[PDB]
Amino acid sequence: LEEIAQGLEEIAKGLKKIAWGLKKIAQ
Amino acid sequence: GGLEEIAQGLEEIAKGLKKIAWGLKKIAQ
Amino acid sequence: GGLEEIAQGLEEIAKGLKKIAWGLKKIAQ
Amino acid sequence: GLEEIAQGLEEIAKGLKKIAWGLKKIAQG
Amino acid sequence: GLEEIAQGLEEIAKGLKKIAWGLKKIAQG
Amino acid sequence: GLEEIAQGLEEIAKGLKKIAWGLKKIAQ
Amino acid sequence: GLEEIAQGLEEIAKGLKKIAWGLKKIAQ
Amino acid sequence: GLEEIAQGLEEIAKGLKKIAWGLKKIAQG
């Protein structure tokens, strides 16, 4: 369960990076 | 560098999925 | 060109993987 | 939980279709 | 070759949508 | 809805073949 | 780079296939 | 079924990494 929580956190951080990357692409 | 950041984000998601896979594998005893 | 489409689609995929991940967590619990 | 997974799979499908469009454009220049 | 890959992704997308519909049906149970 | 899941798994396998052949084309 | 992206998407599809099959085996 | 889900997640992780490398290549020209 602890390792699942960490993985869900890493996924959120990655989605944020992708969001910022798409904004940079469109600007 | 927007493409580089999307790449890095995909790697971070990959790492996270692997950790979830490890957790589910433990649930399987 | 098509690079914008690919980047956009990869974000959708990533978002769908997040939902799948949380859905599995809810089932494991 | 199972419904969330399904919604995630549907979002992955949309993302794949967007990627398909990007490749199709690249294929045509 | 890009057109084939695009078509393949589109085909996987439809299969994922069909799988998704199936999970929602089981969820309703 | 087990029949729809089986059909989707088959659609994925079919799509997975088209990607393999497209990769081969690009490889050549 | 396009080749690598295609290969990765092929791998994702294969993994989603395994996930779907597992969920199916769980419901049954 | 839980093990197969974990294996599928791991395979997805591997595919995500390949996509990132392809994005890094395109970003470098």
Numbering used by the authors:
A (entry chain H): 3 to 29
B (entry chain F), C (entry chain G): 1 to 29
D (entry chain E), E (entry chain B), H (entry chain R): 2 to 30
F (entry chain N), G (entry chain I): 2 to 29
Give verbatim lines from the article:
Here we describe efficient routes starting from validated parallel and antiparallel peptide assemblies to design two families of α-helical barrel proteins with central channels that bind small molecules. However, targets with parallel helices require longer connectors; namely, an outer layer of helix–turn–helix–turn–helix motifs that are packed onto the barrels.
We solved high-resolution X-ray crystal structures of three peptides using ab initio phasing. Another structure, with g-a-d-e = Gly-Leu-Ile-Ala, had promising solution-phase data for an open hexamer or heptamer, but, interestingly, formed a collapsed antiparallel octamer in the crystal state. Some plasticity in assemblies formed from these types of peptides is expected.
